[PDB]
Amino acid sequence: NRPNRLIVDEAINEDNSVVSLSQPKMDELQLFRGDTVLLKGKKRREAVCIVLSDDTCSDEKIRMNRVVRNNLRVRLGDVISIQPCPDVKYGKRIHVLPIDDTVEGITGNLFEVYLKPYFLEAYRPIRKGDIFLVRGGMRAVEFKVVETDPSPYCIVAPDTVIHCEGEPIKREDEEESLNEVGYDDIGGCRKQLAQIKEMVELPLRHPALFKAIGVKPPRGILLYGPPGTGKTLIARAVANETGAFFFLINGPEIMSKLAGESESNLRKAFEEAEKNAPAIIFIDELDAIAPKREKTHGEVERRIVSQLLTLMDGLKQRAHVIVMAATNRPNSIDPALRRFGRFDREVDIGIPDATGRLEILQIHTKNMKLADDVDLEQVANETHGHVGADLAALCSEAALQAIRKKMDLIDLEDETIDAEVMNSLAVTMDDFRWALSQSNPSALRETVVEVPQVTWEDIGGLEDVKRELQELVQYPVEHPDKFLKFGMTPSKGVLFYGPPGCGKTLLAKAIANECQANFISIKGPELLTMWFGESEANVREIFDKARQAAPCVLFFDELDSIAKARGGNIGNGGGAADRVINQILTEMDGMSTKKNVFIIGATNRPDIIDPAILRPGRLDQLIYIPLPDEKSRVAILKANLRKSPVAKDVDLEFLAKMTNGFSGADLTEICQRACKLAIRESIESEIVPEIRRDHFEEAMRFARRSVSDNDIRKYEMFAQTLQQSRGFGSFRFPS
């Protein structure tokens, strides 16, 4: 038994002496809330930390940060021994000194700038011989214990004096640098990063297991994403956290060699990593190495591609090397590389969402000190087209602005800077706004994927439609047991038709938010570009991106916008079928029905929609969104007024009754006009900060009905023709 062995895993808190344990873990080992333990690992070394309460990690695993993982020489997946230590122990004299690998540039006091704001009111239990890292001064510097009283009996106390000599010491090869790349340095990538964690955990941490079994290990991992997403960061972090010898192979570095030298350089890079097993061979750019799809210009290019292909599939076990290649675009790769044995496991790393970029900002700003009025929530929202490298550049530029506001008048003309100035240099929002306005996003044209923040509370009315949407996309994904028993497959998608500006997009986004799945949206111009551009082959890429991002919903806005541009029911001498809808149907028919992917079709002119899409099998479920009723319009305003401060004066119920033929869009622009009037009257009166009732009274003058009465009749007759519930309404069984 020996219930003291726990699985080491990454922590969540950014502190130093923190251990995250579940309630039953301390309840089994008679451990309390505010106690200390003694973690013991390999190489005859121990560590003293503080246990904390957790409820998310696991049942029998320990969450330990990178700062303390390097102290015990224990990586992820290894096992350690934990035991309580209720013995009283105080600190008297702690002597520490940093290592010269990171102190080059520090001048002045070292206690007041790094130790005082870290050791006081913390009661961090230090251990003689441990390496702890502290952050501050827009950098990261650690410290090393060289001589102290024999451990245990080392706990920082307010009445403990600290003195240091001043010169640093050199480190050894036993410990790794804390400034390197780790799992805690990656943000905005959780679904993709977890797959890579679980994919290479066995062959790297346990190389001897695969040598004794017939299981084929994954020999190739291809990474996607626009340049700057962080593929190299993830590749280096996996190697640095799994104990594998990382070997970086740059793209242009090999191609820059002469004729025949590139072959030797690429070939010598494989056995070198094979000897240092386990190892990870990473390729920076692979589209620039083997673009053997359309280029095929030059014998040396093909020779390099063939050499790479030969060295790729020729890894018949031997060592335990895993090759992870990175590229920019999936189609820009040689198809011969995707053969089974060279590159079979495929990983797509997308642009982080709003909740992902905040983690990147927290990672990139953890070394510097910010002011109280600095919030990263608005920065992530305002930066919705940027990538991982974009935000690091934004942070660097924002940090540079603060230096410019103090270097000019202080004029520290010294060979090295002091640590007592940079700590006080707090970056404010004004520094970030200057850099945000000039940073050009590198990721704007390709489709962005989210899991939208809009929920059911933002949608007013449409209660009949909500239950229907929560009936076909949430039941097969949560309770499939009642589906395979009957032997019938679920629906492939549902089409939305009705008057424009009623919520055709809000329902699709809310159903994605509730189901916790990705959301891909295609607008009208996006569909029209591939028609006018005479290139309909881009549907396959959209469907592939949706498939491997499962679960996800495939939303097509105004699907009839391609038939409206060429007439409609009659139009020109052609019919109601074109190349883009052709390719969409072709890719939907061959789409995997067992996957969690879903397709949402939105249209405002259902009379011109091709019937070929509407058969049972592609899009059979049709839900009509009518105009909001009296109590449906009230909820629209109750949901739209949650952002702007409006007092109790405005009567929303009375406004809904007068707005009879008003769609959802009109009620939004009414509030927009009222708030614009409020802003205008505030600015004009500045030469008050609340929305009054006469604002809406004047804004109601220009209340234009976007939907007239002529199309209402057409929509209603179309709905009743497609429903056809008459005749069989009184159909009953005799006995």
Place this chain on the structure above:
Amino acid sequence: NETGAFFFLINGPEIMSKLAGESESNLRKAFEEAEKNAPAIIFIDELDAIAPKREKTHGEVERRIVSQLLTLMDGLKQRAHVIVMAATNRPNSIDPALRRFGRFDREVDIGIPDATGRLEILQIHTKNMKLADDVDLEQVANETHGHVGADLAALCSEAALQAIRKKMDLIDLEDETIDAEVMNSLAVTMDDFRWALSQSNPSALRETVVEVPQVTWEDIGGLEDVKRELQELVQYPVEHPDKFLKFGMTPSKGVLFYGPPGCGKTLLAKAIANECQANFISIKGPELLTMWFGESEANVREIFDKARQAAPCVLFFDELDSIAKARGGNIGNGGGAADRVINQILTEMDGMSTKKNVFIIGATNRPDIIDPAILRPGRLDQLIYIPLPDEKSRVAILKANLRKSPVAKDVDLEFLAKMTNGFSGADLTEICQRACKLAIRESIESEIVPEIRRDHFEEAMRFARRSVSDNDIRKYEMFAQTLQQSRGFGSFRFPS
């Protein structure tokens, strides 16, 4: 390995990775080495990457390698007993000079295995490990209908890796070698396979899949007149050809199906392939339209070639008029009723071998816009009209559609058929689909019973929509009577 011949593997990129002139020596030395060890088999991994001399023609070394391969290929004037077997991905991606008589004449096409084929692959790849009692490979093959042989091996490996992850974490056998008393007890369950099945991306989705469909005559409701006619033109010449050559007249080349949509135009074609035990190739409307909108009509030849060497097989064209509907119809634009895709289809059908067992099935729902040039005796002369199901034809439809979902004796199927007068085959399917969806919804809602009750169909019958109205019924009937034209000669008799 089973014939006792010395196998010599020649990789594609391995030869191309050599320098200028070294690849020639490496390829040449690989022939006499196998010749001395006769008998031997010389296998080429990738041949499209060695001799793509069809459009590439870039570089003197590439052409030199192709010419060296061609010279060493046809230069094997007996001598040894070596047989060269080359492998490639796509038939058109090969140099036509290699297909000359003497180098590569025998041609083998290996297709994607069907449902009954993938089960054997799973049994082969799982015979070394131990599975649990609740592990069945029948559903895995059905759920994996776009995967290939290597895909299923990868799926099995990934499923086996999941089981190890659930035990290595807590056991922690930190040893240089594993013990045999642990892996035997590590039984892989269905939960391990389902995780790997959901993330495995099939590599074979766009090219046409070939089967020998599992649907039989018991699944088709009614249409007894049509079954005997189908079993009359495709099963007699293939089983009893002795009475065909004696009369000196060739059998028919194909039969066209016309009628209202959703009546069984595909079920009959699949059942006639199942009964005859032959391959089935299906082409949908969008597949035909892609080669029209893409301005590339040359892909008909590949489809016909794939059908020919997969004999016996049936060539099924779904909604053949879907290409005329996209451009108008009877009048449409300033053009007529003939386009490039139908042009190529006719060109390849006229030159098709009449002695082969291949067959062509044409399906259409707007026969008025079908080009008469296809309809002459010689290409598509047999026409069979599928009318709306009658009273006793609709009962069998439900009796065949209810074989999958558990339904008690309560629901009266005979009474439902009489009220559904103007209902096609498709409407009766969606009625049952709605009823079963209601049953699933009421089971899930009541969970917070496992049988289909009678009020399920009673409520599902409210939204019974007739996909075929009355206006097109008259047009279909008048078209059928115009094409039949059996009047006038009904009382034609011989005097003596």
